[PDB]
Amino acid sequence: KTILVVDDEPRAREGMKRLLEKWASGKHRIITAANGQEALDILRQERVHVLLTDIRMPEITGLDVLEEMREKDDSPAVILISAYPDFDYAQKAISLGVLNYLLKPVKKSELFEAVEKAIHVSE
Amino acid sequence: KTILVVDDEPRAREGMKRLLEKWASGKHRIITAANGQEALDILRQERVHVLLTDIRMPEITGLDVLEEMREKDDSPAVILISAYPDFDYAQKAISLGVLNYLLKPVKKSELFEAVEKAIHVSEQKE
Ligand SMILES: [Mg+2]
Ligand SMILES: [Mg+2]
């Protein structure tokens, strides 16, 4: 399937891509977006099964991305990643049906468990 | 449908019960429990479509109730309520499939939107 990683921080972004690319070992296509605007364009142009996005990104946050996705009912399973332990974000994330809220630094035990649950929810 | 309200404080428990009973108008069945053990017992002995539980309760939290419910073969749709804005509770709730996490003092608007969300999540899974 198609998994879309969104993070304005390139290190964290491309690192999770490599982590997911070797975890998938060719079975899943992993896509990368550097901001929310690009994410929405990939989300409109391609069918994304699992969306993994940061929350705090300039102008368009991950939650803003998810709000525009939830109104359309064909929508990816969403895993949020953030360094911020913010109840408000998590609260909105719940309301919008996010599967997991991973705290940075990313722990790939959690990353992989969440992405498999997201793959399953997509199916 | 059967909606189970769980809160260890009686005033809150009866308050949410009374409001939900008014909105139910007999269409839905409102029952209550005072703690997680009470909830677990009800949850094992009858179908509960919607679970509305406080988190901070003595010995067994609302999140602890949910850990037993996802084991059970069919799950209630779950609304969490709490007076405190706790990220750790919220993050666990997310991982546990919670539909909404409302802050006390509960707002009618938020409460009945979450309940209808739950009602349709349960009707979705029949
Ligand atoms: Mg960021
Ligand atoms: Mg309490």
Automatic annotation (TrEMBL), chain A:
Ligand binding (Mg(2+)): 8, 54, 56
Stretches assigned to the Response regulatory domain: 2-119
Recorded superkingdom: Bacteria
Chain positions with 4-aspartylphosphate modification: 54
Protein name, entry field: Two-component response regulator
Shown stretch of the complete protein: 4 to 126 of 259
